[PDB]
Design a protein around this ligand. Sequence first.
Ligand SMILES: [Mg+2]
Ligand SMILES: [Zn+2]
Lengths: 63, 577, 21, 83, 48, 237, 225, 698
Amino acid sequence: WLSAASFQETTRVLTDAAINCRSDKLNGLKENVIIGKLIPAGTGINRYRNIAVQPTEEARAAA
Amino acid sequence: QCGLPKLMALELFKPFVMKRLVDLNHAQNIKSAKRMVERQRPQVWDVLEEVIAEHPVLLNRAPTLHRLGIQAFEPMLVEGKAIQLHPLVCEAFNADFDGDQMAVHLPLSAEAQAEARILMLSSNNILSPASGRPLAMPRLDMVTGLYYLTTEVPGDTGEYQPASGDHPETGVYSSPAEAIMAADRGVLSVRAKIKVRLTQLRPPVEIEAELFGHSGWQPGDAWMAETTLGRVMFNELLPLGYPFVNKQMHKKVQAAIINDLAERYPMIVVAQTVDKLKDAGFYWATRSGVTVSMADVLVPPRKKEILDHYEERADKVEKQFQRGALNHDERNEALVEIWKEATDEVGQALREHYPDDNPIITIVDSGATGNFTQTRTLAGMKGLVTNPKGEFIPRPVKSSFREGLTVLEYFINTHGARKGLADTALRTADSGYLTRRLVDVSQDVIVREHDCQTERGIVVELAERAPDGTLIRDPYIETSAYARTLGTDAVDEAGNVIVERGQDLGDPEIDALLAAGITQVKVRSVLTCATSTGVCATCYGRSMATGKLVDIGEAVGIVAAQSIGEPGTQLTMRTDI
Amino acid sequence: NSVPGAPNRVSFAKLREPLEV
Amino acid sequence: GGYDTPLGITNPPIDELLDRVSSKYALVIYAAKRARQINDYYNQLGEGILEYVGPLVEPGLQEKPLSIALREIHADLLEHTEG
Amino acid sequence: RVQGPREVQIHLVREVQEVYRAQGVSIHDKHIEVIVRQMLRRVTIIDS
Amino acid sequence: MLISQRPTLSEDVLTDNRSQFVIEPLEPGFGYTLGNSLRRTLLSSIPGAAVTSIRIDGVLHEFTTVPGVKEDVTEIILNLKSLVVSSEEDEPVTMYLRKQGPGEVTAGDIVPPAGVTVHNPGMHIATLNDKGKLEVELVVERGRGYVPAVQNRASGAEIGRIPVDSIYSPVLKVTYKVDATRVEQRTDFDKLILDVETKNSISPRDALASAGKTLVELFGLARELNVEAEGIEIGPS
Amino acid sequence: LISQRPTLSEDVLTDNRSQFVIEPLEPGFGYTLGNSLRRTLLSSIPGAAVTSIRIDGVLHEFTTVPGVKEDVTEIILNLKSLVVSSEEDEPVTMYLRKQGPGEVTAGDIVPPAGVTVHNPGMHIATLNDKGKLEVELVVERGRGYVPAVQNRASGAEIGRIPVDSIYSPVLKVTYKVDATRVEQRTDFDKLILDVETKNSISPRDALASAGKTLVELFGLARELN
Amino acid sequence: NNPLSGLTHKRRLSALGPGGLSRERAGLEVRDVHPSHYGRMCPIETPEGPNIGLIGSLSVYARVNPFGFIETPYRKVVDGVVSDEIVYLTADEEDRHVVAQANSPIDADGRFVEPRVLVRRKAGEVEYVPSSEVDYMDVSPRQMVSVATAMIPFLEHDDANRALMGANMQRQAVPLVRSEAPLVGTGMELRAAIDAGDVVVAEESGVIEEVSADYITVMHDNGTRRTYRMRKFARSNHGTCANQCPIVDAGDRVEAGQVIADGPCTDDGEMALGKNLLVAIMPWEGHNYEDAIILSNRLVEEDVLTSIHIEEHEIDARDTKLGAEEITRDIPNISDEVLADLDERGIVRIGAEVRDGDILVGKVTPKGETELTPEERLLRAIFGEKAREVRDTSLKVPHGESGKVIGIRVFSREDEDELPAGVNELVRVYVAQKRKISDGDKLAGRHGNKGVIGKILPVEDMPFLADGTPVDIILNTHGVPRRMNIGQILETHLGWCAHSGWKVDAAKGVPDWAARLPDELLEAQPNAIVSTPVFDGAQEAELQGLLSCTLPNRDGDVLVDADGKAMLFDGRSGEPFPYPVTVGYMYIMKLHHLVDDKIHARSTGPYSMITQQPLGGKAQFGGQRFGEMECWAMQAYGAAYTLQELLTIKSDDTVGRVKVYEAIVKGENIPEPGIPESFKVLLKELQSLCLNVEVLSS
Ligand SMILES: [Mg+2]
Ligand SMILES: [Zn+2]
């Protein structure tokens, strides 16, 4: 409902969501933008966000 | 690169230079560094230039239509108070130097700097994400320069002419070095047909196959080229492995050349070669001798006779209208048709009267700017002038802007001019609203997985057969069949597999399909992707911005919605569908 | 001209204005 | 590698870096995390050194850690685990 | 409703592409295919 | 007076005979004045020798091909044109080169007496075959610049002689480029980079040296108006 | 072909315009030689020009003087076209003393030793019965033009008014060439160069100075050996 | 910003306001040009922004009827005889009659050579009508035109769009320091300059008793005299100078209605909004690419294009429960080199240069009391510093401006002036600087060709004619044919002809083109002035004839050939350009869009009350707005982290802001972004709007 709220007819969608007790997943792109969380696109997905980087063992030996 | 005013950079990189200057002991303490920088003492400039090295910055111009509206540059300090913008990315920003302003944003985090350096670097995004055509193409001035450079005028100075008995051909040159040495003197012009033994340029495919054999490696082996040394310099711009072209240079030809370069060459190579092309085009635009004047704007001698003939036809139809046999509607329609035919005749007469080397002519056919209708408006006679409602005035204009206009002709022309300029301001806002709606509706479409392994797919007509018996190539293929993935295997008459399923379906693949005689193919598109959320990468197919398969996390929905919504300002209706 | 301090501005006018602005 | 030498921000060729990684975003995260590690090592020089090791390549005069990160990727001195 | 969901996609895509190309503007089909797929996401309910 | 920064020359050897010359720094606006003058002086001021007229056995009217050998005459004349030679004498010296039977034609089989030398002995000229026989006669003289083919005045006496273009300049191609490096800090100073490529007989180094030496000589005549006037001085070396 | 060494003649038209001929050149050299001479002769000739002015009746250069018909910036613009020649590099000062009605010209200015105002017939302003013009000049040698320095950057008085300075005795300069292009290959160029100076130094002197600068700048390259 | 802007501010017609229609209320029908506007309201002068078609300007001959209807005059014709009777007709009155062509073949008796003449009918239809049938004919050409748009020469050759644009930039010209009269113009310039009101006109004739810079006293014919106090360097409403220099002598008789002193943009009593500059229409190394312009540094040296800009700064010394604010020098913790140029009365000495951040007016204010840091208490014992119980609420010169100081206008209650309640002292300081031309400044001609200054390059690096005269300005050729503004090259040719002068050889009969060309035009002196009415002007054949006779300056040299081009040598390489390029003089004016007023940068400024976002505009520290469309492009790249930083720590998160500042002063790694405060504020509005909103962890 957050995306619909920030798009058009804010009052109507707010009223209908409140009546239905519409719990938002907070998983969409626009919602993540509003909250400030990382968007689920580009470098925001879990595969890229949780990349572990450490030097190669041969490179460690070079120091 | 991109310019950046010294004061602008000084204010933008404030804490960076504070920490750097204090680190350099410029000011024992940061409280001192406050006044140290705000007084703009000379020791801040070098310490500022130290911190800009390899720190990318973002440039933005409102409004942002497509994804390429934001680009990242590595700035150099430039004296003055204006942002030095590279003349190649003006198409992306839709930026013109009328006085338009651009905003600059400074990335902060290490992650943000990395993204600016990789994704948003101006060199790394050349192809337009909308249609895949090169968007960093050479624009007006450099196109004119290259068109002048690579044109071939017969009967020029120092041409090659076969001869015997008393003197040889005297048109063959040993090396391009000797060619330019001669061109430094007046003996040989740039655009003269000559013959040169080339070494560092790959000969065309047919000549290479005919002479060099299977091993056609160019820089070692010498070969004879029949061309003009201007085309030799132009070929020198392209990388070593690129074959010789020896063709005149219109916009479409450079578009094809750069598209191929992006297809089969690394990104940095094309980023460098487009820069070289810009330099050469700018340098040769000056010597092109393209200059407008009263002499260059010629009028057709036949204009008076054609105008009088159609005026007599108009007089006949007006007398017919007076008799009452035809209503006023027939009068207006007949006048409109007669005058449209008249302006078509005037246009073709003007086309046949203008020499092929006229400045306006070389501008218009080189594709740099303008259209022949605008030239006809300039010299000759404009045509039909519209009404505030949208109709065409039965009595049209007859002179041209070169011959001048009278007051009421200017009035009626003002009608249409004001109408168009009022319509533009509404249509841009409507396009903005459409973009907003599209972005909102397609926000959740993002690639999630590599392939859904589904077999459902769509079919593209792809050059339906002709009654006479041939393969008439479909006019609309690059927008419909290119950059796709085959949902099945392409097999002709139950024979060999021309293209197996899961292929990029590039130009060689489509050429093989047409050669095999096949017409109908199944395409794995997004409309049948079996993924629950988003679309699989294979279903989406090749990404136009990169030229490769789309990545696993690119937001295809936003890029799409922007591509549909971007050209909204170029939409114009016809004269109840 | 018809203005006391008017500098001499030769003009390509073909007809005379019946009245001044 | 017949391309003439680069200049400025593109000192490591983008394509040579891209062949090292699976996709562009993974390379961005590569570079970002390596630059973070470089900065932590620089801040741990005087005090107790953590498990982080600084520039495995020779560092220049004053280069931002992202540049050394990319040069390290160009020398194949790092490996990563995809999420 | 008379030619199924397959034909309407073709009709919509061809129509919008013709409209955009009337001014000589080239946009690949997949861009509009994404949108038309987005429109056809829902289905109406005709029985309780 | 002084420009406050002594300009420097940087020479970067690329090939056996190919170099890049850099003038850094430079007084503002002088980059083009130096660059164009230097390139023109290099192109048309360095003395050198080149072939001028060509006569070969068996030809008096056949300007397409010669028997004995199989290939045409344009290849031969171009290959002869692309020949380096240093001559310390100003008179047109005659050359010869002959051999019997099929084989490879190279400049090493030429017969240069004292006073003239050929620095490309290993250059393919023709491919004799079919028990062929050729006798190639060359005319070479020294000078400067670039001059096209000059018609034979004694056409009747020398009907087998053919004029040809000549490359008198030992340097082949020179290009220059200017930039705006370190302009703000050092008052709009700029680099001037020169690319020089010459024949293997001489080198770009002494070629540019002689070009500048010639330029300074021909410019001291312009200087010789007020022997003690006011200008700008460089400094030490 | 020509093996003769180039020469340099002189042709004087007026007291400030001269024609220079350099013969014989090499085909294609005349244009670049003329351009190279002209750029430095136009932008790199040392000269002397006014730098700062001071008026006892004003505090800055945006206030009229009581009595003068022109406004202050008009006198600045008028004396911007002065012709002053000095020989010492040390800055020197001048003086202006005019009272009562009448035109004030550069001839009124009394310059000290070593400063000659070659254009005394040029008028500066005009006065009336209440004319009170006490104007201070300073002149220093230099080259090119220098924008007005800030009176606070240097330890100058409040009333000191900086003025844009342009040190360029050369006014206009052009060159023309006419090659021979004889079929006997006897080709040479004949460069005809024109210099017009602002009555400060003769064209001969400006050409000599430019030639000296070029000779040094090219002997820079000669030393490579 | 010029007399033309003042003229067109009046005599202009708006459609907005009480009882009118707003922009959103305005449909496409209102913005059009109704055929009834002919002669009533000019169809050119109009703002090009969102207000296109709503705000317009009155024509030059139009008059307001007593009832509020716009009324125009027109000649009346009978039986092919036009009388000199001038009648005034309203809009609806023209329906009943037939008005004829403004420029018609009159035969010195009123009859037209051919019967069918182009006339305008009732319903806006333009058709041919026999001469005996028409009853009215227009007063003159340029009757359907406005004053601002009547100054464009060769108007009939320019497109409506470019003419509209040029008329718009006419109002935006700035006053230079010389204001040279244009070489080629229109007769309207003199009348506009006289009627603008800022050019003083001698109301009554007589001889001149005495002339001076500050005053002029004219000796009338009858005993009494008249003195005209002059205005020097008066600040305008748009920060432009208003210098007024006299142009008379000590004893020359003047006539009532004669110009006495020129205004800001006038010379010799006629309009002068720019300068005459040599023009090259060729492209040059891409520095003029896409409407850019490159100028000669001679204009910088010769002060050809430079404008004074007067700036006014105000300080209010009101009454407060701290007591009062004194204008003194007792400012806590100040150095000396910054206080050296400030008098002992609390203001700047008249004629002291200042720059950004300098102290301007010393308004000491009692600081009050807050938490004095303990560190201050320790600090005062190390150097002996006093408490300094007053806050230094002085005047700091804001960023991006400098210059000298003009004067002080000080008001005080002790001076017994009508200051506002509670306010005790009002001080207004004036700062002025001479703004040179520079890259980024917008230049434009009168045909609508705009563009910023691409490069200011020295005189050596420009094309120059065989005369050795360096070119002044360079324009791109691509912009001419693609914008339908062919009139600019016509103006260039005419300007060159006027600059050189001509002597048509009417020895063996008058040339055919010169036959219709009037007298006293076949002969002209160099640097003469010519005029050209917008619609009744010089024809193409006349321009060709003028180009044919182009007598040289001092030597024998026809630089511009018959066709109009000219030969130019490159100043960089030195070889002649392979093809001739047209050269001439075009009128160029500086626009009030200088780069100095449009440069802005911000590192960390103030924030708003409700949300912690920065403010907007150059008046405050500003900060660029990152709209949601730019966020769409952010998402399209997929650069998630950059968007996150932009929306969290560079804009909103207070703790994030201070932490990131600490990070790039300590050289430490930038920490993770926090929770934006604006989102929390939205959450609170939803919660207080009777909407139960709760964020669920899991
Ligand atoms: Mg623009
Ligand atoms: Zn799928």
